[PDB]
Design a protein around this ligand. Structure first.
Ligand SMILES: *[C@@H]1O[C@H](CO)[C@@H](O[C@@H]2O[C@H](CO)[C@@H](O[C@@H]3O[C@H](CO[C@H]4O[C@H](CO)[C@@H](O)[C@H](O[C@H]5O[C@H](CO)[C@@H](O)[C@H](O)[C@@H]5O[C@H]5O[C@H](CO)[C@@H](O)[C@H](O)[C@@H]5O)[C@@H]4O)[C@@H](O)[C@H](O[C@H]4O[C@H](CO)[C@@H](O)[C@H](O)[C@@H]4O)[C@@H]3O)[C@H](O)[C@H]2NC(C)=O)[C@H](O)[C@H]1NC(C)=O
Ligand SMILES: Cc1cc(NC[C@@H]2CCCO2)n2ncc(-c3ccc(Cl)cc3)c2n1
Ligand SMILES: [Ca+2]
Ligand code: NA
Ligand code: NA
Ligand SMILES: [Zn+2]
Length: 808
């Protein structure tokens, strides 16, 4: 019940919403069917439109008008945005030259520069270049302020998951808004785009920027706007709030536009109909900036122009139907479109079976435009699994395609030429970032970054302490003139042991054998040196990784590689080695094919054993430092140490052996040397964070050797590739991956072909940030470089995407 008989008199767009059953006058009352009876009359005046004209100049105030052109309007804070231009001979903001804003120039009584977020739905990154002719205000913000070529959204690249990621700094799996449609099996409740359930607070996790501000004593304008409030009125409301007295005035505001997404769905991202909505958005920007200029705030406010996701060409006729794959289609529920999520129609039906559903959808048709995954097997870079609202079965849909359950769903429910939702690496889903104001840099281009990073920066712009989030605070310091956040490196928690020779070969009963007894003061003085770390400067280029949790581990040095060996997990946490451009690939000699050698620095009790592999019929083993890349026949024996061995399914060994024999050398050739760090990952509860030992669900049969869920590699070189990786004086370049450790290659439909046709494609799909590996391993990399810590934070958040260059 709402007693809509109250009034909005003196309450229009009031900042705190009132509780039922009193009627509301806030910018969301329309959405709740709850506004007072006089809200339209008082709060949505439209008379005479939005612009001053010559003849209105100096008019007698008529309270009926949408905005005012009378002498008193500046003190009232309700002039039309073009009042000074029309009636006082002023210029438009966009017509003024840009002039660096070195310090904030604020009116008296402003404690801090206010922040205004101008968020645009469906604003694809290439619009900044392609629509430049028709967006002069936005082009001025971009060229005068700080901009990125594009900003990466989160997956899925839908509206609510991305706007709430902007507000919280969290992945959708953590904030809980995991799609535009959801079922929560604990609440037994559904979330939909249309309706009232979406307003229930229990859906919305984490702590959004407006709550962070409020809890810390910074007032916030309400960010959300009912769709029927026109854009001009939204801008006028923001400008009116900026005229409130100091003790009532918010410091942070948001405007939101439903365009260009709305028209992009209908016409496609580059439909000729798209020019007009871009003109209209630009005009809105113009109104805001003229309005700030009138208030003398245009060199005081920080303005962010930011999109939620882009838009791709998608039509009715590019739809895959699950009815062409499955016989039991009526026993499943599908969340359809640019991603698919599958669950059982009924929890009472015990003949439903995810394993056979997945098998019926896997590589079934030559040109298949979607790939099914159990959610825990999706690329870790998507961070899309740890939430009960995400269904176990997921379909990754190719860009430009839909998936639907049955053809009738697509015509009895073409109408559309654009959509979004796809993998957040896809070029068409990238969106925009521009920052303009006293706290942002002047005429500065910054590299692309992810939208999960923005919350930290918005908190910095307001002097707030961010709630715990997924951004890496300090990674976007290079956007800011001042208010930088000066992070310190985490403290190492476990210090390593440095074992010497402590065991005789005969103490080992591992069932391992090696043909190595084919056995000099020159070359034995030298081998002692290598075991003490004499080549460590070559193979460990950025310092030892720090171990950020409590554990027991040993540093092991060798001629060709260095490792940090876990006595708890019986294998390295990390193995580091450098391959120069000149390095040669050799083979594993026949007599060494099955060679495994006890490591006399590490006890039998803290070693793996070969008998466990012999008896485990499913499981084989590989090496972290590859024997193919040994520097000499003698150094090669080090690669067969039991302390360099890790468990690998035979199907995975195909992938790993190709990466090690063929790809590392190729990268060294191309990048002028590389440094490689590889190791295992255990994430059995798919939370993106390192497992403790009691979370491990699989061991090599009959042993305590834990089986990794994934294997990573971090491959670093010099950004200036005229310098070799091991002699680099400046910035670094990195690419990394987190490969799933699977017993089959069902993910790769071309896997019966030669590895040269499918392995590298697999690795590219599983590209990752160093920061993702950090979470998954409890390690901190790049501890000793000549670079600034902020620059290293930026490197650690870099993702190598393998997309072509944005623009054609
Ligand atoms: C991305 O960044 C985020 C934020 O830093 C990280 O997420 C955090 O991870 C830690 C470590 O797991 C979590 O700590 C645990 O906290 C709970 C208490 O949880 C409640 O309080 C907090 C604080 O206000 C809330 O934020 C929580 O909100 C969650 O649940 C509600 C529903 O109740 C929901 O609205 C939210 O969307 C959110 O859901 C997500 O997280 C939960 C897990 O908390 C998960 O189930 C879900 O699928 C979503 O992903 C919540 O109200 C505490 O009880 C735990 O203690 C238990 O474990 C310890 C181990 O030490 C045991 O000893 C003990 O017996 C307990 O059983 C944890 O300490 C933290 O909650 C979580 N925060 C958020 C906002 O998600 C991510 O890890 C980051 N991701 C990556 C890849 O780095
Ligand atoms: C999740 C969500 C939803 C939403 N509108 C939805 C509701 C439903 C009906 C009308 O309003 N908006 N509007 C603005 C923003 C936003 C702006 C800036 C930033 Cl930084 C973050 C979020 C936002 N976020
Ligand atoms: Ca885990
Ligand atoms: Na052997
Ligand atoms: Na085996
Ligand atoms: Zn849309």
């Amino acid at each position: 019940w709402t007693a809509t008989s109250g009034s909005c008199k003196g309450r229009c767009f009031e900042l705190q919403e009132v509780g039922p059953p009193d009627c509301r006058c806030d910018n969301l009352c329309k959405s709740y069917s709850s506004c007072c009876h006089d809200f339209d009359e008082l709060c949505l005046k439209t008379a005479r439109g939005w612009e001053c004209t010559k003849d209105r100049c100096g008019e007698v105030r008529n309270e009926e008008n949408a905005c005012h052109c009378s002498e008193d309007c500046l003190s009232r804070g309700d002039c039309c945005t073009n009042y000074q231009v029309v009636c006082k001979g002023e210029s438009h903001w966009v017509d003024d030259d840009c002039e660096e804003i070195k310090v904030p120039e604020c009116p008296a009584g402003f404690v801090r520069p206010p922040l205004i977020i101008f968020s645009v739905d469906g604003f694809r990154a290439s619009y900044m270049k392609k629509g430049s002719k028709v967006m002069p205000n936005i082009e001025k913000l971009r060229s005068c302020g700080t901009h990125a070529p594009y900003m990466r959204p989160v997956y899925p690249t839908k509206t609510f998951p991305n706007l709430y990621t902007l507000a919280t700094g969290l992945y959708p799996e953590s904030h809980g808004i995991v799609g535009n449609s959801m079922y929560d099996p604990v609440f037994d409740a559904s979330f939909h785009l249309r309706g009232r359930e979406k307003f229930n607070h229990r859906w919305w996790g984490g702590q959004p920027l407006w709550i962070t501000a409020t809890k810390q004593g910074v007032r916030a304008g309400t960010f959300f706007w009912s769709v029927s409030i026109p854009h001009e009125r939204r801008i006028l409301t923001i400008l009116q709030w900026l005229s409130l007295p100091d003790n009532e005035r918010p410091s942070v505001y948001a405007f939101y536009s439903e365009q260009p997404d709305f028209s992009g769905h209908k016409y496609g991202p580059f439909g000729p109909e798209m020019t007009n909505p871009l003109r209209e958005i630009d005009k809105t920007v113009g109104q805001l900036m003229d309005g700030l200029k009138q208030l003398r705030l245009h060199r005081c406010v920080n303005v962010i122009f930011v999109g939620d996701h882009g838009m791709e060409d998608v039509t009715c006729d590019r739809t895959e139907f699950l009815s062409n794959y499955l016989t039991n289609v009526d026993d499943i529920t599908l969340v359809p479109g640019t991603l698919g999520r599958i669950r059982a129609k009924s929890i009472n039906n015990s003949k439903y079976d995810p394993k056979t559903i997945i098998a019926a959808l896997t590589c079934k048709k030559p040109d298949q435009h979607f790939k099914p995954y159990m959610k825990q097997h999706l690329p870790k870079r998507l961070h899309y699994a740890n939430n009960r609202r995400i269904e176990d079965i997921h379909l990754l849909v190719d860009r430009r395609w839909h998936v639907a359950r049955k053809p009738l769903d697509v015509y009895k429910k073409c109408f559309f030429q654009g959509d979004h939702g796809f993998d957040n690496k896809v070029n068409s889903m990238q969106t925009v970032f521009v920052g303009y104001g006293p706290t942002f840099k002047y005429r500065t281009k910054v590299p692309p970054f992810e939208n999960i990073e923005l919350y930290n920066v918005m908190c910095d712009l307001l002097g707030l302490k961010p709630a715990p989030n997924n951004g890496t605070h300090g990674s976007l310091n290079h956007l800011l003139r001042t208010n930088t956040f000066r992070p310190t490196m985490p403290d190492e928690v476990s210090r390593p042991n440095y074992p010497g020779i402590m065991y005789l070969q005969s103490e080992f009963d591992l069932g391992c054998t090696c043909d190595d007894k084919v056995e000099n003061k020159l070359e034995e003085l030298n081998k002692r040196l290598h075991t003490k770390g004499s080549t460590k400067e070559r193979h460990l280029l950025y310092g030892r990784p720090a171990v950020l949790y409590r554990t027991s581990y040993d540093i092991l040095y060798h001629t060709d590689f260095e490792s940090g060996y876990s006595e708890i997990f019986l294998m390295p946490l990390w193995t580091s080695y450098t391959i120069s451009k000149q390095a040669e690939v050799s083979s594993i000699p026949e007599h060494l094919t099955n060679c495994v050698r006890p490591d006399v620095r590490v006890s039998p009790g803290f070693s793996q054993n070969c008998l466990a592999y012999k008896n485990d019929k499913q499981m084989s083993y590989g090496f972290l430092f590859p024997p193919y890349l040994s520097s000499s026949p003698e150094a090669k024996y080090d690669a067969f140490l039991v302390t360099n061995m890790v468990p690998m399914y035979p199907a995975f060994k195909r992938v790993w052996a190709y990466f090690q024999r063929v790809l590392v050398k190729k990268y060294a050739s191309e990048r002028n040397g590389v440094n490689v760090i590889s190791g295992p990952i255990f994430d059995y509860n798919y939370d993106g964070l390192r497992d403790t030992e009691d979370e491990i669900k699989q061991y090599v049969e009959g042993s305590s050797i834990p089986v990794p869920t994934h294997y990573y590699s971090i491959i670093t070189s010099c950004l200036d590739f005229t310098q070799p990786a091991d002699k680099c004086d400046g910035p670094l370049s990195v690419s990394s991956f987190i490969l799933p450790h699977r017993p089959d290659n069902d993910e790769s439909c071309n896997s019966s072909e030669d590895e040269s046709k499918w392995v590298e494609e697999l690795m590219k799909m599983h590209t990752a940030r160093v920061r993702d590996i950090e979470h998954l391993t409890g390690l901190d990399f790049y501890r000793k470089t000549s670079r600034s810590y902020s620059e290293i934070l930026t490197l650690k958040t870099y993702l190598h995407t393998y997309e072509s260059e944005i623009g054609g």
